[PDB]
Coordinates of C-alpha atoms and ligand atoms in Angstrom, one line a residue:
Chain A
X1 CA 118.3 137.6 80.1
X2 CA 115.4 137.2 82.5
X3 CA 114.3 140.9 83.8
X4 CA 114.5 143.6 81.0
X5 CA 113.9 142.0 78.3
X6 CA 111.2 140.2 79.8
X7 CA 109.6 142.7 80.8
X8 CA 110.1 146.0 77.8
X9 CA 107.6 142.8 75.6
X10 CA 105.4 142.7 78.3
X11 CA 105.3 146.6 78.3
X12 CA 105.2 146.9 74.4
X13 CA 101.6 144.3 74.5
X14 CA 99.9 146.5 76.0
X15 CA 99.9 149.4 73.6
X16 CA 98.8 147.6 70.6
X17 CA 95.4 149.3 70.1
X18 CA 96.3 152.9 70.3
X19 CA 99.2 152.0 67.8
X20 CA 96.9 150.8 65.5
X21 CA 94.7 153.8 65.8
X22 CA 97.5 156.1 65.3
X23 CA 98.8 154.1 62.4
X24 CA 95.1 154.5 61.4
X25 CA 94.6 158.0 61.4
X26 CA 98.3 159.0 60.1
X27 CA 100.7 157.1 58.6
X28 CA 103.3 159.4 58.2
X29 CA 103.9 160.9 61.7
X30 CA 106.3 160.0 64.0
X31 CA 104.0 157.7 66.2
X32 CA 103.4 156.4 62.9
X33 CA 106.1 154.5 61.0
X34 CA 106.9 152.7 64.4
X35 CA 104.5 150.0 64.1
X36 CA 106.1 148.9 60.3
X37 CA 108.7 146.9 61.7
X38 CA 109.2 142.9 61.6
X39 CA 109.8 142.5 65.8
X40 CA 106.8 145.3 66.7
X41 CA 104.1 143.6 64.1
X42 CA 104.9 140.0 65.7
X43 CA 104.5 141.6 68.9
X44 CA 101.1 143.5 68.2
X45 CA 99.5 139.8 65.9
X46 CA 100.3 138.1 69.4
X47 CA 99.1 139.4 72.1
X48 CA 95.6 140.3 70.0
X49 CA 95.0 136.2 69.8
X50 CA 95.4 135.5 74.1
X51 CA 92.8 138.4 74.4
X52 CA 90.4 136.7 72.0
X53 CA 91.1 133.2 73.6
X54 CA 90.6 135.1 77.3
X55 CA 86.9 136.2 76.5
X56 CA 86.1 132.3 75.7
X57 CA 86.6 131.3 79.3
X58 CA 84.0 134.1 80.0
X59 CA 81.6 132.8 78.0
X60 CA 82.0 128.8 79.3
X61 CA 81.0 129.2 83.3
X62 CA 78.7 132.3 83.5
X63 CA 79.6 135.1 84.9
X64 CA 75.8 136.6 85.6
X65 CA 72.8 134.8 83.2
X66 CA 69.8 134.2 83.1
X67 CA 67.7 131.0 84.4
X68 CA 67.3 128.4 80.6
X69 CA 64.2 127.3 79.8
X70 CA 63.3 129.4 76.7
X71 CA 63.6 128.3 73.1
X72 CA 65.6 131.0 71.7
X73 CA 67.0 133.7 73.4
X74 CA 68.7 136.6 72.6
X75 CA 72.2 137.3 72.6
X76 CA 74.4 138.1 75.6
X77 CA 76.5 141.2 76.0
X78 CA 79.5 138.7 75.7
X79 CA 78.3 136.7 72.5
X80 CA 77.9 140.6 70.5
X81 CA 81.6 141.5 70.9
X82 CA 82.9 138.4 69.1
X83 CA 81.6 139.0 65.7
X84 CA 84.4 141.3 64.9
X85 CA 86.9 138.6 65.5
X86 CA 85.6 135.9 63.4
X87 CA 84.4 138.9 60.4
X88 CA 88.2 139.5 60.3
X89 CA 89.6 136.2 60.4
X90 CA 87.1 135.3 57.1
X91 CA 88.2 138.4 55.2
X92 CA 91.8 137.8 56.4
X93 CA 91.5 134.0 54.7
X94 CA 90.1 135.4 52.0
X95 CA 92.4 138.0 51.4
X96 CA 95.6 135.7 51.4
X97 CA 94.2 133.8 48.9
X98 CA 94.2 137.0 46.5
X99 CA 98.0 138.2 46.3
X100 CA 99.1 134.1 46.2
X101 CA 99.3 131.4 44.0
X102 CA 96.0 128.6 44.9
X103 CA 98.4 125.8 44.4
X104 CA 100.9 127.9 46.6
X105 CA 97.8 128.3 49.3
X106 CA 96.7 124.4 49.1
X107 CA 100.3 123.4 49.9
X108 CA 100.4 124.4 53.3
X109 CA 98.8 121.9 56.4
X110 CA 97.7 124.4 58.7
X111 CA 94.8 125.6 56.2
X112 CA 93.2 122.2 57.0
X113 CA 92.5 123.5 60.2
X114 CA 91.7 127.4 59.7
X115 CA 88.4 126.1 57.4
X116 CA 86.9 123.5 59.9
X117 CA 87.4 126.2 62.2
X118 CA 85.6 128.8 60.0
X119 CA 82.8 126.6 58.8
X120 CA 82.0 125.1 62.1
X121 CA 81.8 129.0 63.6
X122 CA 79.9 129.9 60.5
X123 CA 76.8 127.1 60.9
X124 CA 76.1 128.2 64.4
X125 CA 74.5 131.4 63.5
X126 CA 71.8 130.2 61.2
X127 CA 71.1 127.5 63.9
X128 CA 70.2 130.1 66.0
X129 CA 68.3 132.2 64.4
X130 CA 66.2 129.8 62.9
X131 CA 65.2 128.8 66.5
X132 CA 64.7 132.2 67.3
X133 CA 62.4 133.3 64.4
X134 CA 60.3 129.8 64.3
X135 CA 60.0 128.9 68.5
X136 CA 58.5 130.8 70.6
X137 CA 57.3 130.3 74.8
X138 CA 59.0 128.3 77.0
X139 CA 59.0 125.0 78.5
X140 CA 60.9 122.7 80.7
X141 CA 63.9 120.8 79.8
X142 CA 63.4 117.3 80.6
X143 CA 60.5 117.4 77.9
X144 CA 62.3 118.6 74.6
X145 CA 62.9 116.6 71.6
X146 CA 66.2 114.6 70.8
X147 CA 66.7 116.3 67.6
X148 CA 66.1 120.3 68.8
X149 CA 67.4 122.9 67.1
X150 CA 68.8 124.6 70.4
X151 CA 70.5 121.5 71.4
X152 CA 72.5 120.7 68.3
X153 CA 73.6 124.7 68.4
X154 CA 75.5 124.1 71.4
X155 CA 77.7 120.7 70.4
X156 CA 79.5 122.5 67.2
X157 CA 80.0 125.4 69.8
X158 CA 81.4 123.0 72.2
X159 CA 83.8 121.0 69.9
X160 CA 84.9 124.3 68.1
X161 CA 87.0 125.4 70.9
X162 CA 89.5 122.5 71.4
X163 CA 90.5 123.3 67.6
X164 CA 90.8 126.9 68.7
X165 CA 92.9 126.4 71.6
X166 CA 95.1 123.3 70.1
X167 CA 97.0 126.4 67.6
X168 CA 99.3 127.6 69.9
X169 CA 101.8 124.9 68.8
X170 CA 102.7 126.8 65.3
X171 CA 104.8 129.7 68.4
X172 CA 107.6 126.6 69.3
X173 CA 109.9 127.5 66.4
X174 CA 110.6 131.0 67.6
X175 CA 112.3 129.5 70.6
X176 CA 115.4 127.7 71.4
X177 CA 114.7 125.0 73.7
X178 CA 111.1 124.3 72.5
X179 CA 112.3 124.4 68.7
X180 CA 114.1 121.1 67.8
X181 CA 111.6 119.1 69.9
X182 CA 108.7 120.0 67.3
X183 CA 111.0 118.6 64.6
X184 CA 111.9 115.4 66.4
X185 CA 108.0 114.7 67.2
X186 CA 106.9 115.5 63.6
X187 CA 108.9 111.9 63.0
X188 CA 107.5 109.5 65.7
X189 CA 104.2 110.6 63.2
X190 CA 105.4 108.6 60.1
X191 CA 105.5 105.0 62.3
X192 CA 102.1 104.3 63.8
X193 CA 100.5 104.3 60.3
X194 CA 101.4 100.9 59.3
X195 CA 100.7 99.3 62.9
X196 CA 97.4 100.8 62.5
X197 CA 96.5 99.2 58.8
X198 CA 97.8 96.1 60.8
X199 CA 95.2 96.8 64.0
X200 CA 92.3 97.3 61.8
X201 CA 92.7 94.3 60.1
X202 CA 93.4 92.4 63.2
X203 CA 90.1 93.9 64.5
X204 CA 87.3 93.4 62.2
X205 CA 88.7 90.0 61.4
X206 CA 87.1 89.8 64.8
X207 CA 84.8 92.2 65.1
X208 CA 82.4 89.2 62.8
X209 CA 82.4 85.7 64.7
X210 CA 81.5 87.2 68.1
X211 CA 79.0 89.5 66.3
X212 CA 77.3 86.0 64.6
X213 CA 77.5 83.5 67.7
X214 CA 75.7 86.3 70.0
X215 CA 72.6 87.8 67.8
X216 CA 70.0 84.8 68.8
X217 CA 69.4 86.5 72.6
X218 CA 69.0 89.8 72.0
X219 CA 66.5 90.9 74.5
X220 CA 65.1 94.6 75.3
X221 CA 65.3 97.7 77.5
X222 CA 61.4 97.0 79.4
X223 CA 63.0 93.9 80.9
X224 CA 65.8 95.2 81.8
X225 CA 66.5 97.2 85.4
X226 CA 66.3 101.0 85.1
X227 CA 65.2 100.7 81.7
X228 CA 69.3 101.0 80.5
X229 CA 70.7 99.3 77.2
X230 CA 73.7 98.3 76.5
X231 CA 77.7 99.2 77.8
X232 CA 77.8 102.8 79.9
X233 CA 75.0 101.6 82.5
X234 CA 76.0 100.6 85.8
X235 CA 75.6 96.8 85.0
X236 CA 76.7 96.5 81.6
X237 CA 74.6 94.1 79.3
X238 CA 73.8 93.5 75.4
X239 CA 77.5 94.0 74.9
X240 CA 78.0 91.6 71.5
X241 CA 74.2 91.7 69.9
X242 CA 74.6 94.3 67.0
X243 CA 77.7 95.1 64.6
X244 CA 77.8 98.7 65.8
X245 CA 78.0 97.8 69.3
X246 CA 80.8 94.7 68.9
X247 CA 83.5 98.1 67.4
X248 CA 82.7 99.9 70.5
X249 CA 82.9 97.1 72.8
X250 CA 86.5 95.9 71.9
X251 CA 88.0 99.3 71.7
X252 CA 87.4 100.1 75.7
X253 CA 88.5 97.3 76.7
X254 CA 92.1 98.0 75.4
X255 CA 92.4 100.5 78.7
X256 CA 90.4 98.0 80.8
X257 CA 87.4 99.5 81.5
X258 CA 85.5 95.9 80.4
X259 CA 84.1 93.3 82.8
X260 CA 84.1 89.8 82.4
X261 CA 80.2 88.9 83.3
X262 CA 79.5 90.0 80.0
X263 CA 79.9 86.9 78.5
X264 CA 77.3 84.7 80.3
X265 CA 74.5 84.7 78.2
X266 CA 71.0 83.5 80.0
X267 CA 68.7 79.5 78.9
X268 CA 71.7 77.6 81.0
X269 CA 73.7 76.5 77.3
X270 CA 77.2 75.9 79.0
X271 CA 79.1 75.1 75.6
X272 CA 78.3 78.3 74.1
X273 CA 80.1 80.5 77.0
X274 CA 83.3 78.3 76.6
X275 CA 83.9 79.3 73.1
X276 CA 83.1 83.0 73.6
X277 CA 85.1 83.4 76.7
X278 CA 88.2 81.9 74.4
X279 CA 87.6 84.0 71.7
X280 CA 87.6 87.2 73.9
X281 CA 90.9 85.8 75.3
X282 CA 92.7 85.1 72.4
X283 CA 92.1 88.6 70.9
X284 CA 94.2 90.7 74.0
X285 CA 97.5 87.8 73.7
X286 CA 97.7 89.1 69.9
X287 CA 97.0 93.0 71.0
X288 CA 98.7 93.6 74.4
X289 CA 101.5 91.5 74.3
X290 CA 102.7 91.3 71.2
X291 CA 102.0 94.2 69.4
X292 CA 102.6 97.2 71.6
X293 CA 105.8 95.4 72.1
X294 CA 106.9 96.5 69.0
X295 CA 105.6 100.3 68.5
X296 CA 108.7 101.0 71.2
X297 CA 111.4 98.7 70.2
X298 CA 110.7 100.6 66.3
X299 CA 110.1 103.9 68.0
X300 CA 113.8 103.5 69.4
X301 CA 115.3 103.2 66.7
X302 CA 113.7 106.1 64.6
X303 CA 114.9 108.2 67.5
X304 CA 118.1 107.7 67.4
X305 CA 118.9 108.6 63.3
X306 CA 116.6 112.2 63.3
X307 CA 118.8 113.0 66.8
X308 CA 121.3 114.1 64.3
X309 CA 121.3 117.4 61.5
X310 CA 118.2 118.8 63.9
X311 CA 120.0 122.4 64.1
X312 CA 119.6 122.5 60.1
X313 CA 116.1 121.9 59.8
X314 CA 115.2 124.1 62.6
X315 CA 116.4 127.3 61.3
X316 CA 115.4 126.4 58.1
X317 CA 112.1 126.7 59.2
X318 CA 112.5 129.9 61.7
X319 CA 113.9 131.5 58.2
X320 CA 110.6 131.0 57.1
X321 CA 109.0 132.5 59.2
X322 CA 110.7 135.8 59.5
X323 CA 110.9 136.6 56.0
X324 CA 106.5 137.1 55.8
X325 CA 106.9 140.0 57.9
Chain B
X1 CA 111.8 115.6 107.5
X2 CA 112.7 111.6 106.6
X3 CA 113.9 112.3 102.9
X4 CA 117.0 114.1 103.9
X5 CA 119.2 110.5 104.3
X6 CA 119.2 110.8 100.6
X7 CA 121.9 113.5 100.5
X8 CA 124.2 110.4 102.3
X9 CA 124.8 108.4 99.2
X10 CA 128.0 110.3 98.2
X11 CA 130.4 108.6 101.0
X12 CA 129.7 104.9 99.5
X13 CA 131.5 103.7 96.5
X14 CA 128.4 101.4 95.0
X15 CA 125.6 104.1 95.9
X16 CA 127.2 106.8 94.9
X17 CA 127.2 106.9 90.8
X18 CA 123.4 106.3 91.2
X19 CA 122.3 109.6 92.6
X20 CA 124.9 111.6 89.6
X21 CA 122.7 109.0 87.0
X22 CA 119.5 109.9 88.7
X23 CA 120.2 113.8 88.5
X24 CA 120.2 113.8 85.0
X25 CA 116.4 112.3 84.5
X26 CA 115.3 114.7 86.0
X27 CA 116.1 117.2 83.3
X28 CA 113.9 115.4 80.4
X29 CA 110.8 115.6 82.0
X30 CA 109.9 118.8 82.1
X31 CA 109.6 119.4 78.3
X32 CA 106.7 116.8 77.9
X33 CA 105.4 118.6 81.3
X34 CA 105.2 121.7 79.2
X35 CA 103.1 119.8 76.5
X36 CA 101.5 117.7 78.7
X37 CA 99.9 120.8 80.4
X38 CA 99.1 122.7 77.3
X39 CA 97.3 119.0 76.3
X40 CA 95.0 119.0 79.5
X41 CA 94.0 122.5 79.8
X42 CA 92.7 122.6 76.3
X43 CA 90.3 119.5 76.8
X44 CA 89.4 120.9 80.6
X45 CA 87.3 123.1 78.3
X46 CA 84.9 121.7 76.4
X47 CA 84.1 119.1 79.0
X48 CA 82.9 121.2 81.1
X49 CA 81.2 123.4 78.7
X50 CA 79.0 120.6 77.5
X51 CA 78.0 119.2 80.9
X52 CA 77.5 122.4 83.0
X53 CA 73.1 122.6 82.1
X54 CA 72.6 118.7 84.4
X55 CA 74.3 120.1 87.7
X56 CA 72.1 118.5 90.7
X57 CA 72.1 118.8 94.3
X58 CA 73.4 116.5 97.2
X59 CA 70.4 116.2 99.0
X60 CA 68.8 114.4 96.1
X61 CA 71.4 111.9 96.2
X62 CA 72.1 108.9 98.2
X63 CA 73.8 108.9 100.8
X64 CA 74.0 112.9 100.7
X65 CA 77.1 112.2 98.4
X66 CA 78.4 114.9 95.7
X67 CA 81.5 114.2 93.5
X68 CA 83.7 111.6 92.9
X69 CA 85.5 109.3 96.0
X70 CA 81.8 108.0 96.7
X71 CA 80.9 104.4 96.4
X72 CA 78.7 105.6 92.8
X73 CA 80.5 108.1 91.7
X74 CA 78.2 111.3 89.8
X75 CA 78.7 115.2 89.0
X76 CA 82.2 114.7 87.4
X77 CA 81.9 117.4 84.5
X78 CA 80.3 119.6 86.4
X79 CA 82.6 122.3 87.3
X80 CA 86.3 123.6 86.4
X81 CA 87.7 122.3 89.7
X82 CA 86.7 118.8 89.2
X83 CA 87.2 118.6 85.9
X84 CA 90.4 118.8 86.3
X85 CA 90.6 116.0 89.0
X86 CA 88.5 114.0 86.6
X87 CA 91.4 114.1 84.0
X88 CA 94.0 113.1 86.4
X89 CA 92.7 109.9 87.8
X90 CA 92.0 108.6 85.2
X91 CA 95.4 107.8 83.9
X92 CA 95.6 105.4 86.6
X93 CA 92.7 103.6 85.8
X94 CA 90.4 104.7 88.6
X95 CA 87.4 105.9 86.5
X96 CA 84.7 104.1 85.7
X97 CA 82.8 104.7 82.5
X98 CA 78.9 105.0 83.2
X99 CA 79.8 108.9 84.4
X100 CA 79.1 110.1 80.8
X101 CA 75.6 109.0 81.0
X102 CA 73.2 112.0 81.7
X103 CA 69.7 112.0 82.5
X104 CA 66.4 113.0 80.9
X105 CA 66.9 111.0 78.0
X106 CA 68.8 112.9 75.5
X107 CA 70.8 110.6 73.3
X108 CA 72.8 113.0 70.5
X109 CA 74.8 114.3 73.7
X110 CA 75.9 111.4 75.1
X111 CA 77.3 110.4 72.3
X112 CA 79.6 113.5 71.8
X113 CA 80.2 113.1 75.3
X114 CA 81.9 109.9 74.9
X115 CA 83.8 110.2 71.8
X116 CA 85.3 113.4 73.6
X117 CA 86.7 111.2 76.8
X118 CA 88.2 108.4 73.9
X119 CA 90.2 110.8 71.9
X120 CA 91.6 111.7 75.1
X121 CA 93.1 108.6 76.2
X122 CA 95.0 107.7 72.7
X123 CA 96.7 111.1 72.6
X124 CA 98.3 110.5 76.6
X125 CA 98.6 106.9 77.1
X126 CA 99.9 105.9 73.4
X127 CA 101.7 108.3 71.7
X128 CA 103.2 110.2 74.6
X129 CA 104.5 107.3 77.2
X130 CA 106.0 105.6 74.6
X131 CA 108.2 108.7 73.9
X132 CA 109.6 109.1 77.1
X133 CA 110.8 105.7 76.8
X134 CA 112.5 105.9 73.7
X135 CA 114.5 109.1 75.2
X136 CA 115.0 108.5 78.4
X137 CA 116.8 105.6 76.7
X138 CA 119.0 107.5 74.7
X139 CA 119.8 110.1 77.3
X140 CA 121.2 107.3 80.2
X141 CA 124.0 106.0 77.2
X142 CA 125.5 109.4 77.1
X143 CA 126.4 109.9 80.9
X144 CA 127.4 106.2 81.7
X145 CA 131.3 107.6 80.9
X146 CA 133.0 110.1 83.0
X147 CA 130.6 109.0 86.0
X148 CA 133.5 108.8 88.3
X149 CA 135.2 112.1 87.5
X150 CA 132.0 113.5 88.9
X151 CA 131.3 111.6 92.3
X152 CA 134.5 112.1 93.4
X153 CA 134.5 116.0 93.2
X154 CA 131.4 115.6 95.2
X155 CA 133.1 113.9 97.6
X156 CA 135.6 115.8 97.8
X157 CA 133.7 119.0 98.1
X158 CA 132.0 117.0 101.3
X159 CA 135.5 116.4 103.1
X160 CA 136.8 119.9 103.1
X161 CA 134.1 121.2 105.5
X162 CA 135.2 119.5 108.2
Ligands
LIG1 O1 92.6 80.3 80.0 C1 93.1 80.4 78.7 C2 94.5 80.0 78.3 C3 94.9 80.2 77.0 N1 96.2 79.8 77.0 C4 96.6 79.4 78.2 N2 95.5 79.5 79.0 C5 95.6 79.2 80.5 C6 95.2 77.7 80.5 C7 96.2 76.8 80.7 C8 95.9 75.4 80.7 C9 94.6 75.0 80.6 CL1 94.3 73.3 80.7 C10 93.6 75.9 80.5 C11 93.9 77.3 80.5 O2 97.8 78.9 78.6 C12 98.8 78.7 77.6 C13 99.6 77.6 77.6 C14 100.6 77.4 76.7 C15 100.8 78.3 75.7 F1 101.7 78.1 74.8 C16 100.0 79.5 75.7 C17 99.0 79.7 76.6 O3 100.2 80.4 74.7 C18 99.6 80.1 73.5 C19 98.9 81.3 72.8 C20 97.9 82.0 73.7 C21 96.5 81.6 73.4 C22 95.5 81.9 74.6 C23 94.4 80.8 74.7 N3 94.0 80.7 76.1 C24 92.7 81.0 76.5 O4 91.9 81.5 75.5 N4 92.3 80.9 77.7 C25 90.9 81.3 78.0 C26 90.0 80.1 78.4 C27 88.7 80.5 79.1 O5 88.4 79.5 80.0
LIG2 O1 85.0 103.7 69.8 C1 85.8 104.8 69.4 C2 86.8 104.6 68.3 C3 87.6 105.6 68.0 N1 88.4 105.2 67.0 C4 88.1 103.9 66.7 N2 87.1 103.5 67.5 C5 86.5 102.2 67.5 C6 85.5 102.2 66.4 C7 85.7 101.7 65.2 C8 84.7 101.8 64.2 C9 83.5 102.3 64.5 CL1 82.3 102.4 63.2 C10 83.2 102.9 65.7 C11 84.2 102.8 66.7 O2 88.7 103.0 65.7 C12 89.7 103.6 64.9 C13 89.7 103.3 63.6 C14 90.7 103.8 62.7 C15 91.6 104.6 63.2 F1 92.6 105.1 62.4 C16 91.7 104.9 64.6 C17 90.7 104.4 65.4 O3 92.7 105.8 65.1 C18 92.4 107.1 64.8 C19 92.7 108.0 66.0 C20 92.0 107.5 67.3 C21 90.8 108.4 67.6 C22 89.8 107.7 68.6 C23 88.3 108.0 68.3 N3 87.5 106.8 68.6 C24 86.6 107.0 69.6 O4 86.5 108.2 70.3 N4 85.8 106.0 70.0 C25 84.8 106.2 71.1 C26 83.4 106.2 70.6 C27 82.4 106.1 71.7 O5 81.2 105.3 71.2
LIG3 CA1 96.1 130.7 57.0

């Protein structure tokens, strides 16, 4: 169970690019013929995905570089070998949606997240290159613009890869162990939608009074030390002036990561600082203690009826999967 | 070399069907280890991908101080190494939050920045905790019976060897 038949896969990876050459150049010998079969195919589709998401890491810390202070640079050796990938994932999308119903394509979940990952790869090129035909020169780093092209070309870049790396869940239902605890987690999903229509009406209910008892001492960022604004300095202040800042403000404190000197506002009024400390301590009684007290003891129950018929709906869905190859 | 007088517990009639109820915990964690693994090392990623262009020195510093465990804590995101410490005190609640905030003025960063460290708390400390709880429940109902058909083989197995 745990030697040959671990390792004749392992052996079988390996020689996935010569097979596909030979099935290339003649598909009627007797090296080809071998790859049209349902085990070899799932084989051959899986190990060409770890290589693609091995020569990320390669690209994240540099191996060798150069120093960055140019506009636009060229591209690396590593950056030309990945067009390939993402040419034939595009015409791969495209072609699935030929030979298949649109209704029978828009039906399925896991499409939602194979075009934010296509369009989000797709927008990065034109960002370049438009930096790379207008710029030109080079400058220091400390002295570019807040809205440069070369610095909104890396976030999309950045946040693309977590969706690329989060798709190795879809493998679990080829397993034993790791298959009917996909199907008991795709429940727990179905209970924390109410509790959260209940938390967003519980929150801008008071997301409004603190926001209107605070906005007369608004003061600004020349008078203040370090010339820092707002919650994420190192002495937090202007914490309950705006409405954009009050939404972020009572969100981090659900972890704890809030002080309490926020409250005292400066000009010496003491009966102001009474009401707003009780209205920031009414708010976590109705949040910490009686609410999350409830996500478990419903939680606990849901478990305990989906426990049962979870061998019926897991090979259900395993049949599925063998019968596209 | 002092939490050997654990495998003692079988020769005592109240401490005994403890350890046989404690053994069988020990098999439900390592699922949600699996996930929880998988969960980490794909946000270890873009963390440090964002963050790697600020990297200063120590001697610039106060103190000649570089990492985290300082009195002001600084260069968190900065490498793959302590990104991954980062991650794993913070579930405690030993982080503080003004270690997003990067110099030389940029705004649009920080921003991403910081919506990247809050997704990552709702996925670990409210969806996942509150599922161990709900089976670790359901798993201790199941082996309360026969619990003395099982200590006494033990026990027996102990007396034979001398
Ligand atoms: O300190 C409190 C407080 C409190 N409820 C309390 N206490 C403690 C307390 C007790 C006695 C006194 Cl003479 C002063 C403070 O205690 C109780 C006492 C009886 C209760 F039944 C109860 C809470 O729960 C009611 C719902 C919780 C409302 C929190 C308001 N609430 C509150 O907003 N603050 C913040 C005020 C900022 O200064
Ligand atoms: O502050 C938040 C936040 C949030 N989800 C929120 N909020 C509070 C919020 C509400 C409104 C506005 Cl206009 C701005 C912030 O609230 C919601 C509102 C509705 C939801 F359905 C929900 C969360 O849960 C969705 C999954 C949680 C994702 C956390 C992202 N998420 C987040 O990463 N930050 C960090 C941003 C750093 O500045
Ligand atoms: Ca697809």
């Amino acid at each position: 169970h745990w030697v040959v038949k671990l390792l004749t896969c392992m052996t079988i990876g390996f020689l996935f690019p010569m097979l596909s050459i030979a099935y290339l150049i003649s598909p009627r010998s007797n090296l080809g013929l071998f790859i049209k079969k349902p085990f070899i195919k799932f084989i051959c589709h899986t190990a060409s995905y770890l290589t693609f998401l091995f020569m990320l890491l390669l690209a994240s810390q540099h191996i060798v570089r150069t120093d960055l202070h140019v506009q636009g640079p060229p591209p690396t050796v590593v950056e030309w070998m990945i067009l390939p990938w993402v040419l034939g994932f595009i015409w791969g999308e495209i072609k699935e949606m030929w030979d298949g119903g649109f209704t029978e394509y828009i039906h399925d979940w896991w499409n939602l997240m194979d075009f934010a990952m296509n369009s989000l790869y797709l927008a990065t090129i034109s960002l370049k290159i438009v930096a790379y035909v207008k710029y030109n020169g080079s400058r220091p780093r400390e002295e570019w613009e807040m809205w440069h092209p070369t610095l909104i070309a890396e976030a999309l870049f950045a946040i693309s890869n977590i969706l690329s790396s989060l798709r190795l869940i879809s493998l679990f239902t080829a397993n034993s162990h790791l298959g009917p605890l996909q199907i008991s987690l795709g429940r727990m999903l179905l209970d924390i939608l109410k509790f959260l229509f209940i938390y967003c009406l519980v929150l801008l209910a008071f997301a409004n009074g603190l926001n209107q008892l605070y906005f007369y001492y608004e003061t600004r960022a020349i008078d203040e030390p370090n010339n820092c604004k707002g919650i994420r300095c190192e002495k937090q202040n202007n914490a309950f002036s705006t409405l954009f800042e009050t939404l972020q403000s009572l969100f981090w404190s659900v972890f704890g990561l809030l002080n309490l000197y926020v409250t005292n506002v400066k000009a010496r009024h003491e009966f102001t600082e009474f009401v707003g400390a009780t209205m920031f301590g009414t708010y976590n009684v109705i949040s910490l203690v009686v609410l999350l007290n409830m996500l478990i003891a419903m939680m606990n129950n849901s478990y305990q009826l989906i426990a049962d018929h979870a061998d019926i709906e897991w090979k259900f869905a395993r049949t599925k999967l063998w019968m596209s190859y």
